[PDB]
């Protein structure tokens, strides 16, 4: 299972370039992950967090990327916010879980870290699962970049600190499930 291999890959993709991944033929060893007291936000939807290990699904896609520390509050199915209209619109039929935690102490350096970006100007609201990498000039008339450098700092508070997030998404279609079999 390339799970923490996705998580502890030292660099991530951005919130607009959110990297889903194909997961199949695996054990359902989620329990040691939420017994590992290192993650912070534990919000599962459709299936109970302890019940994700028992019941198995198809179409596993983990969306791992970096967002702000106060904007995990804006992470919910159908919550309309700055993350929903421009970065990525979350689905209302979302069956899965979202997990975030801080690792700012290695993300931060003495100077302003200008490597990743975030979509502060997009043209109109997204659908579920939309990836628009169209980084064109913004007609707002007054014409700025559609992305901006994340101004973060170690002096910035934890709500203004970067979090590593993962969104496990499941879709039940006509196929046998390929995740459960562990803890049997």
């Amino acid at each position, epitope marked *: 299972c390339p799970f923490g291999e996705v998580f502890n890959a030292t660099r991530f993709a951005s919130v607009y370039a959110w990297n*889903r991944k194909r997961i199949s033929n695996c054990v359902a060893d989620y329990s040691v992950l939420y017994n590992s007291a290192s993650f912070s936000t534990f919000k599962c939807y459709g299936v109970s967090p302890t019940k994700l290990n028992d019941l198995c699904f198809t179409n596993v896609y983990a969306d791992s990327f970096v967002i702000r520390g106060d904007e995990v509050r804006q992470i919910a199915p159908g919550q309309t916010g700055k993350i929903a209209d421009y970065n990525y619109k979350l689905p209302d039929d979302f069956t899965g879980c979202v997990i975030a935690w801080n690792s700012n102490n290695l993300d931060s350096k003495v100077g302003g870290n200008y490597n990743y970006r975030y979509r502060l100007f997009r043209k*109109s609201n997204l*659908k579920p699962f*939309e990836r*628009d990498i*169209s980084t064109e000039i913004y007609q707002a008339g007054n014409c700025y970049f559609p992305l901006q450098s994340y101004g973060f700092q170690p002096t910035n508070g934890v709500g203004y600190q970067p979090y590593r997030v993962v969104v496990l998404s499941f*879709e039940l*279609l006509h196929a046998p499930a390929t995740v459960c079999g562990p803890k049997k």
Partner: antibody
Amino acid sequence: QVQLVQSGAEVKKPGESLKISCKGSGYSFTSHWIGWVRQKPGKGLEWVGIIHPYDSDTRYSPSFQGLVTFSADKSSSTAYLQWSSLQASDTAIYYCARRTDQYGSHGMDVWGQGTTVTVSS
Amino acid sequence: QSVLTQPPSASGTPGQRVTISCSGGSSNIGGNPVNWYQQLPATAPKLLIYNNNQRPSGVSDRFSGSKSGTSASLAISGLQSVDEADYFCAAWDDSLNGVLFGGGTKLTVL
């Protein structure tokens, strides 16, 4: 009229260089991704790449990286597709593509009209 | 060519409603919204449908689309002789970072 204009019917020799052109007119040129589209005759629709003309930002097919050479200039309002080496697999009708990025969706509403590059033997 | 399964040949009387079904991997149709295209023979292609139901400038109201997750359907009601063209279930996706294309849907009248 928004149009990505490719030139007339193109003939050269293989192995050499050719920079085919695609004028962007009737619209704000560098505000849409311009997609270079391939069509070898008798096949399902083929793809080469798509390029933003600002700093030549590149989203291309990973199985032709470095073979096909792209450029797109704002002041010339022209996307340029170059091959430093031509072959028999290049012989195809090529199209351009203007993505309808106007506070709308993606899809490519305006196309290139089609230009066949050939070698005659 | 990409993994976007499309019927290459359809037919029907003038006035019929064809249904072009398309499916594949969830990174193709389930992730990004399915778009639809149409190319007349020896001409340029043309966009029909974006964002699973929305049309660009210059296409009629017969062309309608739907997306059911990774599945998709083009509905074209009231056929005429304009339907001598191959249709594409095709979208800009980040499966292999491309505007991934379909296998054509060319129709003739009989």
